[PDB]
């Protein structure tokens, strides 16, 4: 029912582990250079729809050849490839669609464009983060935002160290999945198995979990599937040390796991003056924050709210899936009074989800700064406020098991690590807003 498009090398279609599961499409667009030609692809197809080793054991697949025999392709090849899918999606429209790109090139304006245009058509795009031990945001389709970018983890859920390099990281990596010494279908023979590494393996794993999810609920959105892929991922398993101090905060400490089958929120970081951090088209912005390595506003943009931050600063958006919600942002300019700058969700049934300061149900900021409030109405939405103070570097306040963090803040940068609100400096009171069903 769930078709998983695979754009890779050729595949050993016969392979008894993925036999009749995979269909080989008449698409080939590979740059000039025999079993080794099927090698990478077959193993991934095995990882996804394998009879013995597969994640989504039953899943139907379709393969397009975009990589040659040394696994080298072209941006154009891939582009035309994705176009083939879009064209096929218009001919005999298939059910839930998952597109697997277990590849990496440099940053491509056109490919990320191709990916977004295709993703907006409600297609679940799963891609490898890259095996270069670098910020994924410099690679494509890795850098792409609507694409689920996947980093690879070893047997101890730590990041894969591939030769002198290893797994890519950064704010572009959506989550991490096992990608070291993976046993899957080997092209050596119709019944052979082999252990391969890399972010492709990681992507393919997630591509499987995604396929699994849509088998159960075909109507799921990309934004819904992402939020759930995040929610049910194993948290804080990775020793952040393996990454540069610079990239640690930005890198999600998630390790992919099967979601069994409610409010979901996610932290969205921006690139380093004005910085913008945006939510998915069906996601609501419930909070906005910012951060500097040294020392924010919620504005509207095309009928959709965005987190805007003013060396450079990161706009930190909190994107949530809040069914049937009437949200608005009310802003009160500096009062210059000793009490402070205040603003409240003056309406009834309209709860405060988050605050935003730049220079009960009420935001209190410094006298000289303008204060923004996120006021949302949703069917039965409770919103607690938890505070924590200590007499420092980082203080942390966290929502109780049943509450989703909608808004992290520092009492007069600061950000939300899963359901934990963090405040950073050199009494320090941290403020978290917790919302419910």
């Amino acid at each position: 029912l769930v078709e998983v498009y695979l754009l890779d090398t050729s595949i050993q279609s016969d392979h008894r582990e993925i036999e009749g599961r995979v269909m080989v499409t008449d698409f080939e667009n590979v740059p000039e250079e025999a079993s080794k030609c099927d090698s990478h692809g077959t193993h991934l197809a095995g990882v996804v729809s394998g009879r013995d080793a597969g994640v989504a054991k039953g899943a139907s697949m379709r393969s397009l050849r975009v990589l040659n025999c040394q696994g080298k392709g072209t941006v154009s090849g891939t582009l035309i490839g994705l176009e083939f899918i879009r064209k096929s999606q218009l001919v005999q429209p298939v059910g839930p669609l998952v597109v697997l790109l277990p590849l990496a090139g440099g940053y491509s304006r056109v490919l990320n464009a191709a990916c977004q245009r295709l993703a907006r058509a409600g297609v679940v795009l799963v891609t490898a983060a890259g095996n270069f031990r670098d910020d994924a945001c410099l690679y494509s389709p890795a850098s792409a935002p609507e694409v689920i970018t996947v980093g690879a983890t070893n047997a101890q859920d730590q990041p894969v160290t591939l030769g002198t390099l290893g797994t890519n990281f950064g704010r572009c990596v959506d989550l991490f999945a096992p990608g070291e010494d993976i046993i899957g279908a080997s092209s050596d023979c119709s019944t052979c198995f082999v252990s391969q590494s890399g972010t492709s393996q990681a992507a393919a794993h997630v591509a499987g979990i995604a396929a699994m999810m849509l088998s159960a609920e075909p109507e799921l959105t990309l934004a819904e599937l992402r939020q759930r892929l995040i929610h049910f991922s194993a948290k804080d398993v990775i020793n952040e040390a393996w990454f540069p101090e610079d990239q640690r905060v930005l890198t999600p400490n998630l390790v992919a796991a099967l979601p069994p089958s409610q409010l979901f929120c996610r932290t969205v970081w921006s690139a380093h003056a004005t910085a913008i951090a945006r939510c998915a088209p069906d996601e609501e912005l419930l909070s906005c924050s910012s951060f500097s390595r040294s020392g924010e506003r919620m504005e509207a943009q095309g009928g959709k709210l965005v987190c805007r931050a003013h060396e450079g600063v990161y706009a930190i958006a909190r994107c949530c899936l809040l069914p049937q919600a009437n949200c608005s942002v009310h802003t009160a300019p500096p009062a210059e009074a000793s009490m402070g700058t205040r603003v409240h969700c003056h309406q009834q049934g309209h709860v405060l989800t988050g605050c935003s300061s730049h220079w009960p149900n009420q935001c209190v900021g410094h006298r000289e700064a303008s204060i923004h409030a996120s006021c949302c109405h949703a069917p039965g939405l409770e919103c607690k406020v938890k505070e924590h103070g200590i007499p420092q570097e980082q203080v942390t306040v966290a929502c109780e098991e049943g509450w989703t963090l909608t808004g992290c803040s520092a009492l007069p940068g600061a950000y939300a690590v899963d359901n934990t609100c963090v405040v950073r400096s050199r009494a320090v009171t941290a403020v978290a807003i917790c919302c419910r069903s």
Partner: antibody
Amino acid sequence: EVQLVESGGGLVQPGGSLRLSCAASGFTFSSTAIHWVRQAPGKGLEWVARISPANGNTNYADSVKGRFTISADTSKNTAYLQMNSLRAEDTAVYYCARWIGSRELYIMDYWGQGTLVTVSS
Amino acid sequence: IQMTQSPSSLSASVGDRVTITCRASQDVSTAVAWYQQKPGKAPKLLIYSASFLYSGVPSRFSGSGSGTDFTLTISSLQPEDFATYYCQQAYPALHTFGQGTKVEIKR
């Protein structure tokens, strides 16, 4: 210097639970697949379940489905078999064996000594 | 999943060419293996991938196999060869063993 040390086995009552251990030494643990093959006294060999330590990927025998569960501790280099809802028929010598590393997945090159599981009231 | 060994017991003397038949539950390609277990001991691998002779296993040992029908051949039988032999269906998902063949000494 490649060995699969088998421990945890013994006597347990019907309906009871039992945990077993497979201590892997002298080879890259995560890299391979580890199986459990039981054998009732007068009877032959029966594969019960497998695991691929890095992936965590498993497959079981329909005979043992839902009752037994394979886990692996990559840090401690040990494979475990959690045998809940035990029957009387489950009486067997439990072997753990490693995959040859190539070709067909069920090819067991090295086998453990075996741990005895006796289950009766 | 039924994998059948023929015979269940064969008796022969040192030097004889011993043969053991094996029928897989379906076309299993060359996804077959042969194991030798001595009473009170753990089984020992002999042949894999239907014809591949595992390291250190004496050259006496041969493996033949179409897709359904397979055959272990112990050319020039030996005293230490007198043991119980298992067939293995190392095919994806459907994994089984044969009933076992006891290589007996004729007196």
